[PDB]
Amino acid sequence: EVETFAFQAEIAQLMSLIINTFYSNKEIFLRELISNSSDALDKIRYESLTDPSKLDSGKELHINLIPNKQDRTLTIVDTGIGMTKADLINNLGTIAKSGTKAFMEALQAGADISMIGQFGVGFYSAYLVAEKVTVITKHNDDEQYAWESSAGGSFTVRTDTGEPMGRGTKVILHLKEDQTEYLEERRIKEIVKKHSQFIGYPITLFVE
Ligand SMILES: COC(=O)c1c(O)cc(O)c(Cl)c1CCc1nccn1Cc1ccccc1
Ligand SMILES: [Mg+2]
Ligand code: NA
Known part of the structure; x- marks a missing residue:
């Protein structure tokens, strides 16, 4: 069984601004999600x-x-x-x-x-x-x-129903077809180094 909910108006409005903006410094998404992970690791x-x-x-x-x-x-x-x-x-x-x-x-x-x-x-x-x-x-x-x-x-x-995780959170980004650079090792490595490497938890970038 699946429950569907409407966002609060203000959240939907923000999501529409973000998904449609041409803001060029998009790489900040990764810093924000790693920050959320760090906060969650602190909490536990x-x-x-x-x-x-x-x-x-x-x-x-x-x-x-x-x-x-x-x-x-x-x-x-x-x-x-x-x-x-x-x-x-x-x-x-x-x-x-x-x-x-x-x-x-x-x-x-x-x-x-x-x-x-x-x-x-x-x-x-x-x-x-x-x-x-x-x-x-x-x-x-x-x-x-x-x-x-x-x-x-x-x-x-x-x-x-998927594989049990044990504890924690998994964020799966289904990338826009013109944002495929964030699958490239060289690019992810840059962004982590520039914005996230002083997080107090190990960050492992898997190979593909
Ligand atoms: C406890 O925080 C986590 O489990 C966690 C994490 O480990 C890594 C992450 O990238 C994110 Cl987004 C979260 C959740 C962070 C959150 N707190 C409040 C609001 N939201 C956003 C939200 C996004 C989507 C669904 C529910 C909440
Ligand atoms: Mg919306
Ligand atoms: Na692009």
């Missing part, structure tokens, strides 16, 4: 300080970058805290409504799309390079779920 780490059993689902805290030119996908995998179904629906709620609303006001006032993460809505920079985004996630307190959207004003949530 701080939690495990008191409750070490919280790492029973996976002791390794890392980020993997998996390009696939056959599928035209860039996947970012982390073993952070993951999200419950409730988290998946709540995270698209009122904190995200006010952040998107305010980022759009900043852009009108001369701000740069690169500031998106400052309002806590950096995830949506994915749509600079992706026509569809699938988020697979597994939290200790819930089962594995798949969130997905092609920025048409709606997203879906379903229980995920």
